[PDB]
Amino acid sequence: KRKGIILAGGSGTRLHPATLAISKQLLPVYDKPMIYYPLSTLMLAGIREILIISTPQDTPRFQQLLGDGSNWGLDLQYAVQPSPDGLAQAFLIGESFIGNDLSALVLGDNLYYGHDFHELLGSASQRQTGASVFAYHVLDPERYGVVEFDQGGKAISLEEKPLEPKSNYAVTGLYFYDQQVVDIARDLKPSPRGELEITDVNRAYLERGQLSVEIMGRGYAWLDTGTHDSLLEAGQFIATLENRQGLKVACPEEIAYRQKWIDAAQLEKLAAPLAKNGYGQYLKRLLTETVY
Amino acid sequence: KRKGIILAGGSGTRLHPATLAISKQLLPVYDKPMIYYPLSTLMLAGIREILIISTPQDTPRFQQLLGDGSNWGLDLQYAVQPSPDGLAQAFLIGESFIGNDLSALVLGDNLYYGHDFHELLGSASQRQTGASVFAYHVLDPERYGVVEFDQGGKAISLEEKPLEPKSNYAVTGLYFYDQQVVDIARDLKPSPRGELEITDVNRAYLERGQLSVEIMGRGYAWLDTGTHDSLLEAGQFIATLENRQGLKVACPEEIAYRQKWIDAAQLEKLAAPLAKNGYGQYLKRLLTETVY
Amino acid sequence: KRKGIILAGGSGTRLHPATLAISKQLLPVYDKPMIYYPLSTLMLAGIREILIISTPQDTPRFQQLLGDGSNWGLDLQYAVQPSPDGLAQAFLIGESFIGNDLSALVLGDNLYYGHDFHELLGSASQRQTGASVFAYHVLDPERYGVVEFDQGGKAISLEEKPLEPKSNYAVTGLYFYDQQVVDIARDLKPSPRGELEITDVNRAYLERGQLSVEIMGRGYAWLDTGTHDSLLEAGQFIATLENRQGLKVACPEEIAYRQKWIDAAQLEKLAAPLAKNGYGQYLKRLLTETVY
Amino acid sequence: KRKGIILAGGSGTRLHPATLAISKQLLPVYDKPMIYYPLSTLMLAGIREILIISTPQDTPRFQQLLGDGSNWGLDLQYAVQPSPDGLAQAFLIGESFIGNDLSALVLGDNLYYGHDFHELLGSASQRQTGASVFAYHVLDPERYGVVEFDQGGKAISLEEKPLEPKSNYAVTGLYFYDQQVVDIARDLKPSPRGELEITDVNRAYLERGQLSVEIMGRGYAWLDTGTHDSLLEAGQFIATLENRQGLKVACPEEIAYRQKWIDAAQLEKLAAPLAKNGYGQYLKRLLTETVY
Ligand SMILES: Cc1cn([C@H]2C[C@H](O)[C@@H](CO)O2)c(=O)[nH]c1=O
Ligand SMILES: Cc1cn([C@H]2C[C@H](O)[C@@H](CO)O2)c(=O)[nH]c1=O
Ligand SMILES: Cc1cn([C@H]2C[C@H](O)[C@@H](CO)O2)c(=O)[nH]c1=O
Ligand SMILES: Cc1cn([C@H]2C[C@H](O)[C@@H](CO)O2)c(=O)[nH]c1=O
Ligand SMILES: Cc1cn([C@H]2C[C@H](O)[C@@H](CO)O2)c(=O)[nH]c1=O
Ligand SMILES: Cc1cn([C@H]2C[C@H](O)[C@@H](CO)O2)c(=O)[nH]c1=O
Ligand SMILES: Cc1cn([C@H]2C[C@H](O)[C@@H](CO)O2)c(=O)[nH]c1=O
Ligand SMILES: Cc1cn([C@H]2C[C@H](O)[C@@H](CO)O2)c(=O)[nH]c1=O
Ligand SMILES: O=P(O)(O)O[C@H]1O[C@H](CO)[C@@H](O)[C@H](O)[C@H]1O
Ligand SMILES: O=P(O)(O)O[C@H]1O[C@H](CO)[C@@H](O)[C@H](O)[C@H]1O
Ligand SMILES: O=P(O)(O)O[C@H]1O[C@H](CO)[C@@H](O)[C@H](O)[C@H]1O
Ligand SMILES: O=P(O)(O)O[C@H]1O[C@H](CO)[C@@H](O)[C@H](O)[C@H]1O
């Protein structure tokens, strides 16, 4: 078993004033709330016990949206981050939830998509030691954690938002950890940025030779909804795929069902209330259509 | 003086599950909350005393977002609609707010844009008799109120969502009324749809020869965000204009400044808490730029 | 009697490799060739006699697409620009075509759209002395002819691509001239960047107190297809309008019919060969539907 | 040894009037001509010897855009298809080019993208007996060749544009064939639509138990640029990927270099004439960056 966390707080300042009305993680990416996407990432990694961390004001809305997750065969729990003082705080806030288990953290505004993503998640999730992170070639690596490799392809340094990146490979917002993470987070001090950085967590594993950095190839989409423009692009991306395929990206209900965490009758039940719109009609179609 | 009403309730069924998260009128259109758009419409019609109607769960969140309106030189009030039992219910809920004044109703998910919109609005709003509605050529008139004209261009019938529309002219979700509307709404009975219909209101006016139907030409954009696809498209439309012009559509702060409802000093104050993003930067820039 | 010129040449080094295949003005913007847009602008300005300038290689193409114009009630003529040595060259190449008449120049990659644009063009067209241009607020004025206004809104200076723009107002690619333009253009010497600049022609009028600069308001859309991104956005812009309205933008046959330049009968013959697709069906519908 | 064919002709039919001036396969998909996309698919499949088939009027245009291929390490040949009389005509027109070799056909308006596409292609290319095709779940299967599967996942029938489709799986425009294909195509009679159908070619192999139908999973994008709306969607799709990643899709120069069909000296010589725009800057960057 691994336990997962979604970090779905922050201010969403870049998204002002849209986010005055509410969390960037409840606004829609095309047809469904942003949070569905990372939730689904965790689900596809075989994780069913998940803690959602948000701001004090938006926590209740997540709870209304998602509940305890039992309807979807999950065990969802909630905690508050008082202030967005770093990714690594997820491990302090979530210490008791983690207990002595393997864990995973996904950022609330990250969206992933691509052929065999299930396998890429499984590989990381099934490991039982160290840390795993994913490196993705981006245009503006300065906005992210940046991994440098040597000539042989081995990662040699990490830097958080460097003005002068040492490569174009960003560390994405998905991280898998062994039982060493909590203790590492606890010994962290705030960065000059004023945050407890996930990059310092990861450097600590790197230093001990225990960070696995796996390339996420160009054939995958890793997007993030942090800007007005990026959020619209993500929306359009999802739209184009779903209207082409007649299939939906990141339907928790679908994923649950395919993973056998809920059964046909349960799914039919989930569909009923949503039946007056296309999402409901889609859940129903899933009962009598085989999709490879 | 004319008083305004924003109907910002409904279930937003077509946007499920995105709207299980929050009211459709709190979702963004590109860069700002949907409600900014109809609010701006009323503002551009010279209306500053506005009633916002929403559901029992969301009415307070709109209150949370916009407060009493004084920071923007407006007088905003709030009322709850217990069930989305029809647009015409705005006049019963809003009966005491209206008093013996002229009124205007704008729908929460309607977005307008175009050259001389201010003039178009002013003309309807400055009339002191009958009713005024706007007729816009659409692809799928079956989804709206439809107005049929004689050979002479005079409006001769209205039908709500006809299976066989008599024309391609839709009645947009903006309505201006004299003192007769409250009594007309109070006598309406539910339609076969189970709704108290604005179309029936407008018909009563038409029957007494007191309905002005003005054409809103093809040069204007009238959009509604009722479906996932249309919400996205409105987002892209707005983004294209804004990214081209370096001007923003339906920024209430800007419009209030321009109508002299607030002065330079007030605007500098509104910009301050927003200064860390592009939207606050833009309000600041307006203090030192003449825009024609 | 005013004659039109469409300047549709230009290096394709930029949008290479897209434009290695097809010159820019032959590429579509959503559903019809780019040149339809500026062609429609001239038509909406009441101009029937039009000269299309392209590269030597592209003139046959333009001719194949458009012909002599007679089927749309136009008089189209063609000329070549060997080298893209400046917009003002259009008046040297077009000297014989213009003769002793008033003229208008439109850029081949410029798309305009908005309420009462007809009336806007008319105001410039009716002026018989001097020149008329339009000013549009843009995000990146450094990329255009920039017009500076004094505190009372009078145009006081023009600079082509200033490093330090004096305003955010661009002079758009739509220019109206009296009889003086050809001699002005003859006297011009190339600018530092080596082009015979339209900005210089406009300044010659300005220095004589004969330049009328009109504001093209923010309710108008003025787009150019100069970048991959900007072409894309212009495509989505037209698509949203067209799909919303069930009406099409810059359809020359429609414009010609509305202007009485061709009759019902002529339009039905234009429609027949296009009848298997949407565009021909749209033209047919125009025959049986009144559009205000 | 497998040879390739791109079929890049076609009525033009619809996209009128966008395609009066030129063929659909020369239109840009965001930043490069559409033909680059299927061209790159064959390249990614390890195919260097390719035949491009088009119309009398367009074949030349393709030749001018791409030449003989030698600068990209390719051997490109051209042939004309007099009338768009069916996809299986490619095997007639292409008979001498193919000789006794294995072959692959791709449709000129098909765009594929996804993680491990190269491995997907390889799998099919390495099967030297019979045929291989791909099945992709779509919303409107009635537009395509449709493939039906039994309860156990085996392909059991094909139907071209069926009125009542038996599944939602379309056969994509990418086909691998052994030596039997030419004769199979030779023996075909046109269908009740008037075409020599690839679906009949495919059926022929199926009826011999020699058709391999592989699932192309939902993690892949398979788009058809055959409508106005679909071309725009594909453009946005590419743009979103390229702008997020700083890597281009279907850049033949890159693919050639990565396959070692050209060396760095060659790649630099290709970058030179494009150096004044982003495209050439990208090529140059590829000489000094490792991309995984
Ligand atoms: C810095 C920080 C970000 N976030 C959220 C916002 C986004 O979903 C994501 C990336 O910033 O993390 C938090 O929830 N807490 C924090 O301390
Ligand atoms: C099976 C399945 C996959 N996916 C996603 C995971 C991948 O990014 C992609 C390919 O499996 O689709 C869903 O979003 N829902 C699903 O039910
Ligand atoms: C029918 C109905 C709609 N609405 C809102 C939803 C949209 O913004 C719009 C049109 O359905 O009005 C209400 O607020 N109350 C209602 O009773
Ligand atoms: C003046 C002004 C106009 N607008 C809108 C009103 C019209 O639809 C268009 C042209 O004035 O722009 C704004 O959104 N904000 C403004 O400050
Ligand atoms: C500079 C120049 C541009 N152009 C065209 C390309 C575009 O449509 C536009 C603006 O750069 O004018 C010419 O046709 N000739 C020229 O000499
Ligand atoms: C009347 C008409 C206008 N237009 C454009 C001109 C303007 O930008 C807008 C408003 O009339 O629509 C067309 O494209 N075609 C037409 O037939
Ligand atoms: C039917 C047909 C299609 N095509 C092309 C047009 C498109 O790219 C594709 C599928 O319609 O094949 C031909 O080149 N020749 C043909 O005979
Ligand atoms: C290696 C490489 C892949 N691709 C495409 C192929 C696949 O669809 C995707 C993943 O390798 O990207 C390119 O377009 N160019 C390339 O250079
Ligand atoms: O989004 P943030 O909190 O500015 O940055 C976070 O985002 C990225 C993922 O989206 C990560 O690579 C960064 O290392 C992390 O700090
Ligand atoms: O959106 P609704 O509740 O189905 O319909 C409402 O909105 C339309 C505008 O959006 C109007 O034409 C209809 O007359 C009105 O009933
Ligand atoms: O596109 P160009 O030749 O760099 O620029 C031209 O186009 C602009 C509008 O499209 C004008 O404002 C410029 O004055 C003119 O030089
Ligand atoms: O586009 P067409 O010629 O109608 O159809 C062709 O294209 C499709 C892919 O684009 C295939 O599934 C069809 O079997 C083929 O006949």
What are the C-alpha distances in Å from C267 to residues C245, C264, C286, D11?
21, 5, 9, 24
Rounded CA-CA distance A106/B184 in Å is 55
Helix (H, G, I), strand (E, B) or coil at D264: helix
Helix (H, G, I), strand (E, B) or coil at D13: coil
Distance from CA of B28 to the nearest CA of A (A): 6
Going by C-beta distance under 8 Å and a sequence separation of 6 or more, which residues neighbour residue C231? C15, C27, C29, C225, D28
Nearest-atom index, ligand 2, CA of A44: 6
Instruction: Give me the residues paired with residue C33 across strands.
Output: C28
Distance from CA of C237 to the nearest CA of D (A): 11
Q: Where does residue C260 fall: left (phi above 0), alpha (psi -120 to 50 degrees), or beta otherwise?
A: left
Cβ–ligand 11 contact at C23 (below 6 Å): no
Parallel/antiparallel/unpaired status of strands B169-177 and B145-149: antiparallel
Which protein residue's CA is at the shortest distance from atom 11 of ligand 12?
D144
- The verdict on a CB contact (< 8 Å) between C33 and D13 is no
Q: Which two tokens stand for residue C254?
A: 């429609």
Rounded CA-CA distance A168/A160 in Å is 13
Q: Which domains does chain C have, with CATH numbers?
A: 1-292 (3.90.550.10)
Tell whether D75 is in a known binding site.
no
Cβ count near D230 (within 10 Å):
17
Facing residue for B246 by CB, picked from C116, C137, C223: C137
Task: Find, in chain B, the residue whose alpha carbon is nearest to that of C153.
Answer: B292
Tell whether D250 is in a known binding site.
yes
Dihedral angle of Cα B282, B286, B288, B291, to the nearest 10 degrees: 120
Tell whether D118 is in a known binding site.
yes
Facing residue for C114 by CB, picked from B219, B222, B245: B219
Task: Determine the distance separating the centroid of ligand 10 and the alpha carbon of B144, expressed in angstroms.
Answer: 5
H helical segments located in chain A? 18-21, 36-44, 59-66, 90-93, 95-98, 117-126, 181-186, 198-207, 228-245, 252-258, 264-274, 278-285
Going by C-beta distance under 8 Å and a sequence separation of 6 or more, which residues neighbour residue A125? A2, A45, A46, A47, A104, A176
Residue C14 half-sphere exposure toward CB, CA atoms < 13 A: 13
Contacts of B140 in chain C (CB under 8 A): 246
Tell whether A13 is in a known binding site.
yes
Q: Would you say C65 and C27 are in contact if contact means Cβ atoms under 8 Å apart?
A: no
CB contact B223 to C (< 8 Å): yes
Dihedral angle of Cα A160, A163, A167, A171, to the nearest 10 degrees: 30
Ligand positioned closest to the Cα atom of B10: 3
Nearest-atom index, ligand 8, CA of D220: 8
CB contact C232 to D (< 8 Å): yes
Rounded CA-CA distance B15/A276 in Å is 11
Dihedral angle of Cα C9, C11, C15, C19, to the nearest 10 degrees: 60
| CA nearest neighbour of A85 among A191, A174, A176, A161 | A191
Cα Rg, chain A, nearest whole Å: 19
Rounded CA-CA distance B94/B91 in Å is 5
Cβ–ligand 5 contact at C27 (below 6 Å): no
Residue A52 CA to its chain's centroid (Å): 11
CB contact A228 to D (< 8 Å): no
DSSP A260: T
Contacts of B154 in chain C (CB under 8 A): none
Task: Find, in chain D, the residue whose alpha carbon is nearest to that of C64.
Answer: D21
Contacts of D245 in chain A (CB under 8 A): 136-139, 218
Distance from CA of A16 to the nearest CA of B (A): 7
Q: Would you say B214 and B135 are in contact if contact means Cβ atoms under 8 Å apart?
A: yes
Rounded CA-CA distance D218/C226 in Å is 35
Rounded CA-CA distance D145/D159 in Å is 6
Facing residue for D114 by CB, picked from A149, A219, A291: A219
Q: Which two tokens stand for residue C134?
A: 């339009």
Rounded CA-CA distance B86/B105 in Å is 13
Distance from CA of B207 to the nearest CA of A (A): 35
- The verdict on a CB contact (< 8 Å) between A139 and D236 is no
Which protein residue's CA is at the shortest distance from atom 9 of ligand 3?
B107
Instruction: Give me the residues paired with residue A159 across strands.
Output: A146
DSSP A212: E
In single-letter form, the type of residue at position D263 comes to D
Instruction: Give me the residues paired with residue B223 across strands.
Output: B111
Rounded CA-CA distance A64/A79 in Å is 14
Task: Determine the distance separating the centroid of ligand 2 and the alpha carbon of A258, expressed in angstroms.
Answer: 10
Facing residue for D232 by CB, picked from C27, C36, C236: C236
Nearest-atom index, ligand 8, CA of D291: 1
What are the C-alpha distances in Å from C170 to residues A36, A249, B3, C213, D110?
44, 43, 39, 11, 40
Q: Would you say C40 and C259 are in contact if contact means Cβ atoms under 8 Å apart?
A: no
Most ligand 4 atoms within 8 A of CB, residue of B41, B43, B113, B261 to mutate: B113
Cβ–ligand 6 contact at C117 (below 6 Å): yes
Maximum Cα interatomic distance, chain D, rounded to a whole number of Å = 56
Resolution (A): 1.9
